[PDB]
Each structure stands twice: as structure tokens, then as C-alpha cells.
Amino acid sequence: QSALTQPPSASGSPGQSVTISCTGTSSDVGGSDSVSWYQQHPGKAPKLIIYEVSQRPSGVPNRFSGSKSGNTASLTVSGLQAEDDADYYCSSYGGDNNLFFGGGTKVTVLGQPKAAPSVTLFPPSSEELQANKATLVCLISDFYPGAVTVAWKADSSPVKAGVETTTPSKQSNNKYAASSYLSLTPEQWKSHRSYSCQVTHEGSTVEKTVAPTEC
Amino acid sequence: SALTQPPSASGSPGQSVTISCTGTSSDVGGSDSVSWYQQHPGKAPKLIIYEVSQRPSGVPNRFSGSKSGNTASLTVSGLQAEDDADYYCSSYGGDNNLFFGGGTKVTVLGQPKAAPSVTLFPPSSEELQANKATLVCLISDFYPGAVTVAWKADSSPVKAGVETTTPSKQSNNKYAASSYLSLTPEQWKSHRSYSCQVTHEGSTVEKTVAPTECS
Numbered sequence: 001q002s003a004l005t006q007p008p009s010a011s012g013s014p015g016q017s018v019t020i021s022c023t024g025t026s027s028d029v030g031g032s033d034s035v036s037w038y039q040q041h042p043g044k045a046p047k048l049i050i051y052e053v054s055q056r057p058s059g060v061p062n063r064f065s066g067s068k069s070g071n072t073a074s075l076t077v078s079g080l081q082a083e084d085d086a087d088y089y090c091s092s093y094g095g096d097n098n099l100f101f102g103g104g105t106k107v108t109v110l111g112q113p114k115a116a117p118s119v120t121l122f123p124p125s126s127e128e129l130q131a132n133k134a135t136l137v138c139l140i141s142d143f144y145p146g147a148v149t150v151a152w153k154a155d156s157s158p159v160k161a162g163v164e165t166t167t168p169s170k171q172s173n174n175k176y177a178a179s180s181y182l183s184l185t186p187e188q189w190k191s192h193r194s195y196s197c198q199v200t201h202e203g204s205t206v207e208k209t210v211a212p213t214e215c
Numbered sequence: 216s217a218l219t220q221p222p223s224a225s226g227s228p229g230q231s232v233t234i235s236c237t238g239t240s241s242d243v244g245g246s247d248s249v250s251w252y253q254q255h256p257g258k259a260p261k262l263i264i265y266e267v268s269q270r271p272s273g274v275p276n277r278f279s280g281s282k283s284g285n286t287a288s289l290t291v292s293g294l295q296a297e298d299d300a301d302y303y304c305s306s307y308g309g310d311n312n313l314f315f316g317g318g319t320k321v322t323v324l325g326q327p328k329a330a331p332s333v334t335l336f337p338p339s340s341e342e343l344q345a346n347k348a349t350l351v352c353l354i355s356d357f358y359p360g361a362v363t364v365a366w367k368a369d370s371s372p373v374k375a376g377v378e379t380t381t382p383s384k385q386s387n388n389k390y391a392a393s394s395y396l397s398l399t400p401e402q403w404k405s406h407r408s409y410s411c412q413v414t415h416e417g418s419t420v421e422k423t424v425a426p427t428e429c430s
């Protein structure tokens with residue numbers, strides 16, 4: 001139950017280098033050339049970025065480089081990009097079929113670019129209307145940082161009920177996505193002239209409006 | 216994933232769960248080099264099985280590993296709260312290369328199971344007139360909070376332009392997420408349909424939409 005030692009955190013702006021260290025003992029990190037490094041985005045499977053102390057697998061940029069000096073392994077990430085913001089784990093085989101893991105280093109990429117959300121409002125789908133439902137979805141994507149507020153309107157009035165908004169999650173483009181959904185009945189949908197989704201990000205507001213279709 | 220694991224497995228306190236890890240004759244079926252790792256999310260993983268069946272010091276005998284042909288299995292018997300985690304399998308191959316499974320989210324049920332409500336929205340008029348044909352597949356009201364989403368163009372898997380949000384717990388204590396497929400109007404208009412397949416607790420639901428003559 002013995003952890004390799006890693007600093008809990010480390011940070012750099014885009015284009016900077018960060019080095020993170022992985023301290024063992026002579027019977028693990030010092031005792032052989034079996035040091036691995038893993039990159040993991042929160043809620044994602046890890047990726048192997050270094051094995052055998054220094055070797056990069058296919059598809060890992062030469063920006064990632066691994067080294068070892070006595071009982072300490074080091075990973076250097078040069079030319080920091082948004083995608084490098086993640087948890088980094090080291091591991092070493094020891095004696096006795098043991099695999100040791102470090103506690104993980106959270107690498108923060110400081111000063112990532114602010115981005116306003118792309119907002120798309122979807123009226124109810126023909127299929128859910130046939131199933132006596134008229135849920136609307138407001139898709140909020142491509143935003144940074146990962147905090148928004150949503151209000152809905154029925155015609156010009158605030159909608160106080162039937163609103164859910166998902167916790168924004170970081171997507172493959174390193175920007176946040178969330179959905180807000182309004183669970184209306186077909187009657188509520190058809191009785192109003194429009195519904196609107198208002199999205200606030202960094203004190204800037206985007207509203208979209210949909211209306212019962214004429215098709 | 217190079218090795219195939221089920222995305223999810225579940226049971227209540229005291230139940231058993233068996234999770235599979237399938238490869239080829241040249242990795243899983245080729246030698247006794249299957250390892251299992253347990254990760255509590257945002258914490259260091261832990262080796263819990265090596266050489267198919269071997270438990271590291273201080274891993275309890277609730278955990279057993281076996282292998283038949285090209286499929287290894289981890290059994291966790293008498294599930295306790297702390298067994299709630301992601302489980303990864305690995306196997307060496309021919310080049311003494313190391314192969315990884317996709318990971319299995321094992322939930323110890325803290326509430327009743329609930330199948331997702333899935334709604335597939337075709338492109339809105341506003342986004343179409345702005346030369347985007349993003350589809351959104353809304354997935355709500357599910358427990359456990361683990362889901363996998365595949366998209367089809369006609370009957371062909373599509374990988375590019377798929378984004379799925381990390382399931383978040385909503386006000387009714389159940390999970391919600393959305394997958395969005397960022398099509399171009401040409402992609403959308405030139406195919407007979409697109410489908411969203413949602414897998415939860417080993418059961419899959421499909422929704423299909425096709426272009427219309429009016430939005």
C-alpha cells in the first residue's frame with residue numbers, strides 16, 4: 001500500500017514547459033527501467049504517454065519526454081497546450097510482482113482563451129410529440145471557462161418549472177458543453193407563441209427562440 | 216480499446232459481479248499475463264490481480280481472476296461500497312507489447328435502476344440557415360450514471376464530430392447527458408438517416424431521424 005511520491009499539482013501557460021517528479025526507492029523506480037507515465041482527463045480512460053522510463057508509444061508527441069536519476073523519474077511536457085491539462089500518474093514495477101503507482105500530479109494550463117458559448121435551441125421532435133412529450137433542448141457548447149447560467153422564457157415570461165441543466169463537461173476541443181432541457185406537454189408547447197433559452201457566460205447573454213413549426 | 220471490456224456492471228451490497236476482458240490468441244489467450252486495476256475516480260489506480268489469478272498483498276479474496284481462451288474475468292463477490300470504481304484489464308502480446316481494456320464502471324446500487332429517456336432532435340431551422348446540422352440525443356432520468364453512445368450514418372458507425380457530456384446528477388437524483396453530432400448541412404441532407412444508440416445496464420435503445428422538406 002506504498003505510493004510513489006509526486007507533487008499534487010504543477011502549472012504553466014501555453015508554450016511553457018513543466019517537469020514533474022516521481023520519487024521511489026532503490027527496489028522500484030531505482031531498481032530497473034520499468035517506469036510508466038499515464039495522462040488522464042477527469043472521467044476519461046488514462047493514456048500511456050511513457051514506458052521503460054523514456055519510450056513514447058505511437059501517437060504521443062515528442063513534446064513528452066521521460067527520464068530517471070537514481071530513485072526519481074521525471075516527465076517533461078514542453079510546449080504546453082490546452083489538451084495537456086490533466087492528471088499525470090507514474091508507476092514502477094518493484095520486486096515481488098508489485099506495481100507501485102504515484103498519487104498523481106494535476107497539471108493546470110493557466111490562461112486558456114475565454115470563449116462565448118455556441119447556443120442551439122431545438123423545438124420538440126415529431127417522435128416525442130407522437131409519444132405525448134414536448135421536451136425542448138438548449139445545447140450550449142464551445143465555452144470557457146466551464147460556468148454558465150440558463151433562464152427559459154414562455155413567450156416573454158420567465159419559466160420557473162420543468163428546467164434541468166447538466167453540469168458542464170470539458171469536451172475533445174478542450175471547451176465545455178452542457179444541455180438545458182425544458183419538459184413541456186404538447187399542450188404547453190402548442191398554447192404559447194414561442195419558448196426561449198437565455199445563456200449567461202462571463203456577464204454576456206445569448207438568447208435563442210423557437211416557435212411551434214408550420215410544417 | 217485494444218482489449219474489449221463491458222462499459223458498465225452493477226449490483227447491490229453483498230451481491231457478486233463478473234466483468235470480462237476479451238482479446239486475441241496473441242495477447243489474452245497467448246499467456247498468463249492478465250492484470251486488473253481498480254480506480255476510484257480522480258484517485259491513483261491500484262493493481263488488484265496479476266498473472267490472471269494472483270492477488271497483491273492486502274487485496275481481499277472477494278476479488279478472483281480467471282481466464283478461458285481469449286477472455287479473462289474478474290469476479291467481485293459480496294460487493295461493498297468501496298468496490299464502486301472503474302476496473303481496467305491489461306495483457307502482454309507478442310512483441311511483449313502491453314494491451315489495455317476500455318475499463319468497466321462497476322456501481323454498487325445506491326438507489327433503484329432507471330433506464331434512460333432518449334430523445335433525438337434533428338437540425339433546427341436556425342442552425343440549418345447558419346450552415347450547421349448538429350443533431351442532439353438527450354439522455355435523462357437514468358441510474359446508474361453510466362451510459363455509452365454510438366452514432367450511425369445510415370448503418371455506418373460515425374466517430375468524427377461525436378461529443379457526449381459526462382453524466383451529471385439532476386434535481387430528481389437521476390443522471391442526464393446529451394450526445395451531439397456536429398454534421399454539415401450537406402452530410403445531413405445527403406444521407407437517408409442518422410441514429411443515436413444508447414446502451415445502459417447492458418440494454419441498447421436506438422432513435423433515428425431523417426431530413427424533411429420543412430423545418
Ligand SMILES: C[C@H](CNNc1ccc(S(N)(=O)=O)cc1[N+](=O)[O-])c1ccccc1
Binds near residue numbers: 047089254
Ligand atoms: C494502469 C491503468 C492504465 N490503463 N491504461 C489504459 C486504459 C484504457 C485505455 S483505452 N483501451 O484506450 O480505453 C488505454 C490505456 N492505455 O494505457 O493506453 C491506469 C493508469 C492510470 C489511471 C488509471 C488507470
